Design a protein around this ligand. Structure first.
Ligand SMILES: COc1cccc(-c2cc(C(F)(F)F)[nH]n2)c1
Ligand SMILES: COc1cccc(-c2cc(C(F)(F)F)[nH]n2)c1
Lengths: 216, 791, 235, 158
């Protein structure tokens, strides 16, 4: 609710999609080739050769890009699934993904958006760090760090972002010469744990009333 | 990718401390995962030489040694089983400070004077080898500080590389980055060509040039494979997490880690008629060096001879073709394998090697020759032998070629949110070894070097600029937007609204796994085939839920077992109905309750929750958008619910959902002793409502009449209330069922329904005659439709 | 054997909000979703904030006791939520994007007019604001509010605080629903905003009028009687 | 045209009970929202606030609309009895608005949330007890409001 409010107040529309997705929307449309390791059964839950449980809410952003022409300002909260499960990782979790596609969007615009969102979210004028990273769907890309002012009980990685890849737009009929865009992703449980001081991620899916009752 | 900083600094030295370098690395896109010292701290330890040993005359486990530090001979008593004359060892002199505050002092061990100590790797925190004394190379410099000699003033930096930086999977790659980052000279290893001593070659055929456009081969005759790998190489490999196995593998590994070129050596005797670089035949069998017997596919590139396959190209060598103890002659290989042609191939056989990784990520297409010469020199140095000429087989047509990229300054300024100077742009791009030629005002034609497989577009160039400039040095702006006032329709019950309503109504929000146990699924949905996962995490997480009920009930009993009496939970989420072909993924709002109706309190009745408590909760939700009248609760049946206490909820005949008590048989099966009340609503049928349509307020009094109605115990109350409304005329403003009686005062198969009827005329007062008239028509209608009677 | 029927549920059910409250929430949402901040101020105001700052001269008929409720010579009950927009302009420098819902008072009372009522006022002050920007904003707001792609008409009007000014009509052969205009240079100047650098637009609307159009309410007096027979209709 | 804006993500703090939130809570708790005139009869003002001089209008519309309220209670009670006289038994109302405390020099204009209840504790129904509302019913309503931002413990009823 809190993540959505930060953006909906500034013109972002809440977009939803199906949890049972296809290879095109979940991978192909996002510049993830057929031979890419993310597609494997070691990371992705499958029903058959083409149908799966979505690994991210990125397919929702794809379905939006196909349906309409820019401007696009969307936030995509939802349940996502990953085959890699143990402590620190659950087979099901929640993440919010964002997308802004307009005529003159920059990496400076992205930095501004992310830095202000984190400040708004954590209710502090905290330091925000942008480290170069990689994603098939974005270029340039960054891993976003914040200080330990919200503890580990001197930086913490909280989210990722980047400028939408030209091929990602092109594939979804958006001219990369006319339109630029930025996208971002974050894990809801990671954020909740930082916010509320929750140590064990497994408390989120047990539904013990002694846990739940603490958030009244 | 792990490496020795000392070795890196020998190529490109950043002139900043370790801490500064490790910091910057992450800030430029090479995230450091670890930085550790290569050894423990100590002083006063030099290279010593054992001149003679003698048996200690008063202790058999000890030896009396004469050891030189290159300046003086000292008598040291030693108990290590490997101590012998000629041995080069670490000599800790009197005064030397060893790890864990161990100061070497003078000693008289069993009547014999000892002026120092000889050390093991363990004693010095070098390795965990306390088996004996750390035996140093026969040619070690006697007297030199052991930390100096063994390059112990060093760290191992481990980088978590991104798939686009395959070029950084070597010391050559990483040093090129450092040189760019810090604008410092790059001094790569000078690799002099090794001259052929003979003319023996083996022919090489490129039967699949599209998958291997370049292949280099070399004959190395009369190698002594009994010889050891030198310490400098063992240390360099170790500091990169490569364990020493054999001299030949160690060299091919060393060259790969040093330059980035994976190489392979064959036993020349195992090559029949020269090399053939070709695709495998379907079902071709090859035993790897690790013993794995792979059954190959026609899409897989192999290195073969004229008789059979010798290796799976760029991933792993075969057992037969490979070097053994009996090997006297070698055939060295350094080739370029196309990344597209190799992608996923190792994984498809369940394999992953340092070679498969580098080739998949990209190996500099021009590198094979420098690597070949380097490995030739190292092989001759380590195991001797005589080199023949290099056989280079190349396919000019299939060599990788990236068209030059035009970079526009305005596009850099736009993207970065600030302009960069032409000199700065050129300096940065040229440091990365890109070819920058000016193409008019604020435009360049840039060429991509042979080691870079991630650069093909103008945006990749801008990324390089941003990266080396510093992401955190870039400006901050907020995106512009031509925004117009907007809103969703007024008359709608959204899920955030409904959640808060349920909170206010005394519910706790649960979130359960979307995939459940097929056996649990079967209990709630008998006879339905769930949408089952092909690769579930466990077998009890194989079925996609068709109801939020199994998950809610399970969370409810989780709590019951945890000393909870009153459990009131709700969940919202998707249901999965049907198989892929026709699958419906509908959002649901479900709830589950048990225990006392009210929490424990002085002012609260101790009655237990029932159907009508859950009913009020459903009613409150169904009324959230002023459309309660659009819904009807009709007696229905559901396999998970008690058939005597189940309501099917409808809107225009369409199914909204169900409300009822969990079936006692299901409870038995789940070991649930308490009554549980469930509801599940299809959100699509709840969200729409109606906007208020004002109806004028009468200035006149309302008139009420009460009716006590005797009806068959089984006739539904809403059927009667509906008949009453239909027969009450135009002025009825309210109808209330204020009591139900099924006692001794009447027949055991009947019930009394006490109803309150209110009428208000909008333009006048109502008279008693007309109201009694209307009342009698209601009664008459109920006598003919239900054989009703007044009490 | 333990069977039961489909009788009403047990206990308390929901009440509801007042139709004006529903309407104010809705108006605010149209703008808050696009960067507008909700601003509030006092109901007992001074002559400066209520009149002088809004280019209403001392001798102006709106100031008289026939239209304005007074406590003394300088203290009054606010005739509009415009003073809130003034207090905002004094407190900060542009950009300003605010919506000002609230109770307002007028001495003129009888049928069609109540001594107390609610209105929402808007203000946007930035570097390059135009009358085209204002038209766009108003037309899209009304469409959003009435949930229809209705025709919007702009008729020239007058206000001391705005120039140019318009009365805004919508179909159903037309109905006046709100007023707007470009902020007067003197209004900005008085509140330390340079009219050479900054332009702005403001708008005003009556909540009861909008609620009456939306819900089909005939008599404006129903809004302040709080008859449950009226209130219950907006659950 | 639609005006351009360099907008940044923002939000109010998480742990706060806003008035739109509290209104909806009271709705769910069985209350109807009333809006009453800010100026009341001086005699009514005196009944609820003895000894206090109201902030009185110089030109009131009528004399029974001359006093600025120092409580939402006189107005709520009046709306409650308006209904009682109009054949209503169970009247559950709430209002939010300003109170006017003191004379012009020192005047406090504070936002209040007030509620008024009467009649049976529960609506007329087959499954409902015929007990009349009391103090502890209103207490639960205040408790629910006071706990809306997870700070119930910060409050005490003395
Ligand atoms: C950490 O997750 C992330 C980080 C950065 C970008 C994205 C992303 C990009 C897109 C799309 F559809 F526009 F291409 N969807 N999501 C996701
Ligand atoms: C019908 O009400 C309206 C119509 C047009 C303009 C305005 C208005 C202007 C201002 C201020 F303070 F900014 F100058 N406040 N309100 C109000």
């Amino acid at each position: 609710e809190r993540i959505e409010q930060c953006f909906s107040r500034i013109g972002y529309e809440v977009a939803e999609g199906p949890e049972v997705e296809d290879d095109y929307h979940n991978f192909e449309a996002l510049n993830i080739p057929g031979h890419h390791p993310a597609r494997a059964m070691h990371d992705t839950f499958y029903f058959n050769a083409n149908m799966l449980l979505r690994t991210h809410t990125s397919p929702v952003q794809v379905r939006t890009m196909e349906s309409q022409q820019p401007p696009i300002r969307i936030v995509c909260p939802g349940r996502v699934y990953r085959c890699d499960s143990d402590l620190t990782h659950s087979p099901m979790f929640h993440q919010v993904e964002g997308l802004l596609v307009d005529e003159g969007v920059s990496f400076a615009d992205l930095k501004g958006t992310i830095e202000e969102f984190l400040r708004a979210f954590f209710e502090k004028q905290l330091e925000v760090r942008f480290r170069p990273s990689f994603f098939p769907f974005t270029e340039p890309s960054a891993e976003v760090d914040i200080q330990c002012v919200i503890c580990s009980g001197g930086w913490l990685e909280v989210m990722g972002c980047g400028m939408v890849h030209p091929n990602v737009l092109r594939m979804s009929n958006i001219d990369p010469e006319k339109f630029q865009g930025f996208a971002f992703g974050m894990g809801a449980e990671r954020l909740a744990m930082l916010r509320y001081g929750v140590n064990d991620l497994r408390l989120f899916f047990d539904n013990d009333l002694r846990f739940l009752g603490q958030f009244r | 990718m792990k490496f020795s900083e000392k070795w890196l600094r020998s190529w490109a030295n950043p002139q900043v401390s370790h801490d500064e370098l490790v910091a910057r690395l992450s800030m430029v896109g090479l995230e450091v995962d670890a930085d550790l010292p290569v050894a423990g701290a100590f002083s006063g330890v030099v290279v010593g030489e054992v001149l003679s040993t003698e048996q200690h005359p008063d202790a058999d486990k000890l030896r009396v040694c004469q050891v030189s530090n290159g300046s003086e001979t000292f008598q040291v008593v030693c108990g290590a089983p490997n101590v012998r004359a000629g041995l080069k060892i670490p000599f800790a002199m009197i005064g030397a400070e060893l790890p864990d505050d161990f100061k070497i002092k003078k000693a008289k061990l069993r009547g014999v004077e000892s002026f120092g100590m000889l050390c093991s790797a363990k004693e010095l925190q070098i390795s965990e080898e306390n088996a004996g004394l750390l035996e140093l190379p026969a040619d070690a410099p006697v007297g030199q500080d052991v930390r100096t000699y063994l390059e112990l003033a060093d760290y191992t930096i481990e980088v978590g590389l991104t798939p686009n930086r395959g070029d950084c999977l070597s010391l050559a790659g990483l040093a090129r980055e450092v040189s760019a980052i810090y604008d410092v000279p790059l001094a790569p290893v000078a690799v002099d060509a090794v001259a052929a001593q003979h003319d023996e070659t083996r022919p090489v055929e490129l039967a699949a040039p599209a998958a291997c456009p370049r292949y280099l081969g070399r004959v190395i005759r009369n190698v002594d494979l009994s010889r050891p790998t030198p310490l400098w190489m063992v240390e360099r490999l170790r500091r990169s997490d490569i364990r020493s196995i054999d001299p030949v593998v160690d060299v091919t590994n060393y060259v790969m880690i040093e330059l980035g070129q994976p190489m392979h050596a064959f036993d020349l005797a195992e090559i029949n008629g020269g090399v053939r670089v070709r695709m495998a035949e379907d079902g071709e069998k090859l035993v790897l060096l690790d013993g794995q017997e792979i059954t190959l596919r026609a899409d897989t590139l192999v290195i073969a001879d004229h008789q059979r396959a010798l290796a799976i190209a760029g991933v792993m060598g075969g057992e037969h073709s490979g070097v053994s103890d009996s090997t006297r002659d070698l055939f060295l290989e350094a080739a370029f394998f196309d990344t597209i042609a190799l992608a996923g191939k190792a994984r498809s056989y369940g394999l992953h090697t340092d070679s498969s990784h580098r080739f998949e990520r990209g190996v500099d297409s021009q590198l094979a020759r420098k690597a070949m010469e380097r490995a030739t020199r190292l092989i001759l140095d380590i195991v001797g032998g005589e080199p023949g000429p290099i056989v280079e087989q190349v396919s000019e047509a299939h060599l990788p070629k990236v068209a030059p990229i035009t970079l526009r300054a305005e596009r850099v300024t736009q993207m970065l949110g600030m302009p960069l100077d032409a000199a700065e742009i050129v300096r940065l791009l040229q440091a990365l070894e890109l070819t920058v030629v000016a193409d008019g005002e604020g435009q360049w034609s840039v060429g991509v070097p042979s080691h870079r497989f991630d650069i093909s577009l103008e945006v990749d160039l801008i990324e390089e600029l941003a990266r080396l400039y510093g992401y955190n040095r870039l400006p901050v702006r907020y995106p512009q937007a031509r925004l117009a006032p907007n809103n969703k329709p007024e008359a709608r019950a959204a899920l955030p609204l409904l959640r808060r309503l349920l909170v206010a109504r005394g519910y706790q929000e649960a979130i359960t796994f979307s995939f459940i146990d097929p056996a649990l699924f079967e209990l709630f949905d008998p006879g339905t085939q769930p949408l089952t996962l092909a690769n579930p995490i466990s077998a009890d997480m194989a079925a996609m839920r068709s109801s939020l009920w199994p998950g809610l009930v399970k969370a409810l009993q989780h709590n019951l077992n945890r000393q909870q009496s009153r459990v009131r939970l709700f969940e919202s989420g998707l249901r999965f109905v049907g198989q892929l072909e026709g699958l419906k993924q509908e959002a649901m709002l479900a709830g589950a309750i048990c225990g006392k109706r009210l929490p424990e309190g002085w002012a609260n009745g101790r009655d237990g929750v029932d159907f009508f408590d859950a009913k009020a909760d459903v009613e409150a939700v169904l009324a959230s958008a002023g459309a309660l009248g659009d819904f009807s609760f009709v007696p229905g049946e559901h396999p998970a619910l008690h058939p005597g206490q189940t309501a099917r909820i409808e809107r225009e005949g369409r199914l909204v959902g169900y409300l009822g008590a969990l079936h006692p048989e299901l409870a038995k099966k789940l070991d649930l002793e308490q009554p549980v009340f469930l509801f599940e609503l299809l959100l699509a049928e709840v969200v729409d409502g109606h906007l208020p349509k004002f109806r004028e307020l009468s200035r006149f009094p309302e008139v009420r009449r009460d009716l006590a109605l005797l009806v068959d115990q089984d006739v539904p109350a809403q059927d009667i209330l509906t008949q009453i409304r239909a027969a009450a005329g135009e002025w009825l403003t309210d109808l209330r069922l204020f009591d139900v009686y099924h006692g001794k005062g009447i027949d055991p198969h009947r019930k009394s329904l006490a109803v309150g009827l209110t009428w208000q005329h909008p333009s006048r007062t109502l008279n008693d005659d007309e109201v009694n008239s209307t009342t009698q028509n209601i009664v008459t209608s109920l006598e003919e439709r239900f054989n009703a009677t007044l009490r | 054997e333990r069977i039961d029927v489909t009788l009403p549920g047990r206990g308390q059910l929901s009440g509801g909000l007042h139709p004006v409250t529903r309407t104010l929430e809705r108006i605010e949402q149209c703008f808050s979703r696009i960067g507008y901040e909700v601003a509030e101020g006092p109901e007992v105001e001074d002559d400066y904030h209520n009149f002088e700052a809004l280019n209403i001269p001392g001798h102006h008929p709106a100031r008289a006791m026939h239209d304005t409720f007074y406590f003394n010579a300088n203290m009054l009950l606010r005739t509009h939520t415009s003073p809130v927009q003034v207090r905002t302009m004094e407190s900060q420098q542009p950009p300003i994007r605010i919506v000002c819902p609230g109770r307002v008072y007028r001495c003129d009372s009888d049928l069609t007019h109540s001594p107390m009522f609610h209105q929402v006022e808007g203000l946007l002050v930035d570097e390059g604001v135009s009358f085209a920007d204002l038209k766009g904003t108003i037309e899209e707001f009304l469409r959003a509010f009435f949930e229809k792609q209705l025709e919007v008409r702009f008729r020239p009007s007058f206000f001391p605080f705005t120039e140019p000014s318009a009365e805004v009509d919508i179909q159903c052969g037309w109905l006046e629903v709100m007023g707007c205009g470009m902020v007067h240079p003197n209004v900005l100047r008085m509140s330390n905003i340079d009219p050479e650098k900054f332009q702005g637009f403001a708008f005003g609307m009556g909540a009861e009028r909008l609620a009456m159009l939306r819900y089909g309410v005939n008599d404006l007096r129903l809004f302040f009687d709080n008859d449950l027979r009226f209130l219950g209709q907006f659950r």
